[PDB]
Design a protein around this ligand. Structure first.
Ligand SMILES: *[C@@H]1O[C@H](CO)[C@@H](O[C@@H]2O[C@H](CO)[C@@H](O)[C@H](O)[C@H]2NC(C)=O)[C@H](O)[C@H]1NC(C)=O
Ligand code: NAG
Ligand code: MAN
Ligand code: MAN
Ligand code: MAN
Ligand code: MAN
Ligand code: MAN
Ligand code: MAN
Ligand code: CA
Ligand code: CA
Ligand code: CA
Ligand code: CA
Ligand code: CA
Ligand code: CA
Ligand code: CA
Ligand code: CA
Ligand code: CA
Length: 422
């Protein structure tokens, strides 16, 4: 009779990743009469013909083309058998393909937002993306990941549609740009990830003013100073960017000695270098109060004020004046009967400067009769040091020198003519 298969249908359950040529199964037919047995496909299917290879003699079924679960999951194959002339025996072969997580998730970004205002309202849609995975089961479910520390809340809009919203108010002065990476994680083991990142640039509002490094300033200038002298350097900082962060310096206008402030001090608008336009004579005025403003470009401008206090330092640049005596007989008198210590005269002198530069000391330089008189060091009193004698001359002359105590010191000289009275 006809041959007999060991089973009218053969089953197998294999994974889709089975290498080509791997033996799938083996079909057996036997003749019961007492040989040569043919094994051939029955109704050849083009997909089944490409995907499965069997020879007649071995009767083994091996893989000819890679099986993709995503293409087809079940195969119904018709097989028969010949003994030569006799009736062809029929038998089915059923191949169950299993799913292997061999497709990482594919993320398609539908909408996006590439810029956001600093003081913007939270809740703006940053991105609306959808993820699709070709695999099946838990190998096909997908989760969307965003860095944890970054303060935003991501939620799923509907089904596999997700939204990326702003949970925390944004401020440009913290970080400039963003490289936000959403990583798609597969649930099937081992998991397969596919990450996609989006770029962003933060809009910058002019909401911060320029701030000075010190709440108040104070500089010092010598009395005489060159034209265009470098007095100070001022610097203010603006945490913004672009036009909204440039600094421009100005000197608020006041009046000194009836003259505008622009007469003595200028500032460079770009570099806070304070320049002195004239020399500040200490005996004319000692100090001036200034106000420095710093603004930014763009609209509207945003500025700040700082209180500068400029002080001129005195310099010994004035010789003492001897107001007494001047060129009334220039001759002072002294009695012949004058006791020791008689106040003959007293030198009067002043000094335009201040402090040690206005500290006068008078000393005796030259005397017609040496031990007769005495000049008070700090009072300038010309007095008698001894009693007068008949030998002493009728007309006397002293040379007094007035010194200031500055650095370096300056002196003056005066000759006193003192007549001896009788
Ligand atoms: C965002 O950052 C990632 C890094 O986390 C960047 O990825 C780099 O890409 C270059 C170019 O192909 C690779 O050579 C590096 O290996 C990647 N860095 C890694 C893996 O850490 C990505 O290009 C950035 N994109 C934007 C828009 O900023
Ligand atoms: C600067 O002037 C503004 C108003 O013009 C004022 O609000 C501010 O207090 C002033 N600066 C200082 C340090 O007082
Ligand atoms: C010019 O130079 C002086 C030093 O001589 C600085 O102190 C000033 O700030 C400016 O830079
Ligand atoms: C601001 O910039 C000036 C330059 O003009 C410096 O001299 C100052 O010390 C501050 O850094
Ligand atoms: C008065 O005295 C001072 C200091 O002794 C001198 O520097 C000056 O020239 C004048 O003679
Ligand atoms: C006082 O005396 C001195 C002498 O050294 C002169 O140099 C000066 O001009 C003043 O007459
Ligand atoms: C007064 O006269 C004397 C001369 O003894 C000078 O030395 C002095 O400088 C001042 O002219
Ligand atoms: C007496 O004479 C002297 C010059 O010898 C003067 O310096 C003095 O002021 C007074 O006239
Ligand atoms: Ca596959
Ligand atoms: Ca698969
Ligand atoms: Ca997958
Ligand atoms: Ca801000
Ligand atoms: Ca800003
Ligand atoms: Ca600003
Ligand atoms: Ca002077
Ligand atoms: Ca002076
Ligand atoms: Ca002086």
């Amino acid at each position: 009779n006809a041959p007999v298969f060991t089973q009218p249908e053969y089953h197998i359950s294999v994974k889709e990743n089975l290498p080509v040529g791997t033996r799938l199964l083996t079909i057996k037919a036997t003749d019961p009469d007492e040989g040569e047995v043919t094994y051939s496909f029955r109704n050849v299917r083009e997909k089944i013909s490409q995907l499965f290879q069997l020879n007649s003699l071995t009767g083994d079924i091996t893989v000819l083309g890679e099986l993709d679960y995503e293409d087809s999951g079940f195969y119904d194959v018709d097989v028969e058998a010949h003994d030569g002339p006799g009736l062809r025996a029929r038998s089915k072969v059923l191949v169950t393909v299993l799913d292997v997580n061999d497709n990482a998730p594919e993320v398609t970004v539908t909408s996006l937002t590439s810029s956001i205002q600093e003081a913007s309202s939270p809740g703006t849609v940053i991105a609306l993306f959808n993820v699709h995975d070709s695999d099946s089961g838990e190998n096909g479910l997908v989760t969307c990941s965003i860095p944890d520390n970054l303060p935003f809340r991501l939620e799923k809009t509907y089904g596999n549609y997700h939204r990326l919203l702003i949970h925390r108010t944004l401020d440009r002065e913290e970080v400039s740009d963003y490289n936000i990476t959403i990583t798609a994680t597969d649930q099937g083991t081992p998991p397969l990830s596919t990450e996609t990142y989006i770029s962003l640039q933060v809009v910058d509002i002019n909401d911060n003013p320029p701030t000075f490094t010190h709440a108040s300033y104070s500089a010092y200038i010598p009395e005489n100073n060159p034209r265009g002298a470098s007095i100070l350097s001022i610097t203010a900082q603006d945490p913004d960017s672009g036009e909204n962060a440039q600094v421009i310096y100005s000197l608020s206008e006041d009046t000194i000695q009836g003259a505008p402030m622009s007469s003595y001090v200028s500032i460079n608008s770009n570099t806070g270098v304070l320049y002195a336009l004239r020399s500040f004579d200490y005996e004319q005025f000692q100090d001036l109060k200034l106000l420095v403003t710093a603004r930014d470009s763009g609209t509207p401008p945003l500025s700040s004020n700082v209180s500068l206090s400029l002080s001129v330092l005195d310099q010994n640049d004035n010789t003492p004046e001897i107001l007494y005596p001047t060129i009334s007989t220039g001759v002072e008198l002294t009695p012949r009967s004058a006791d020791p210590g008689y106040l003959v005269t007293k030198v009067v002198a002043v000094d335009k400067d201040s402090g040690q530069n206005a500290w006068l000391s008078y000393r005796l330089l030259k005397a017609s009769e040496p031990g007769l008189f005495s000049v008070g060091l700090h009072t300038g009193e010309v007095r008698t040091a001894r009693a007068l004698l008949d030998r002493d001359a009728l007309k006397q002359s002293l040379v007094v020198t007035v010194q200031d105590h500055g650095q370096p010191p300056l002196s003056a000289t005066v000759t006193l003519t003192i007549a001896v009275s009788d």
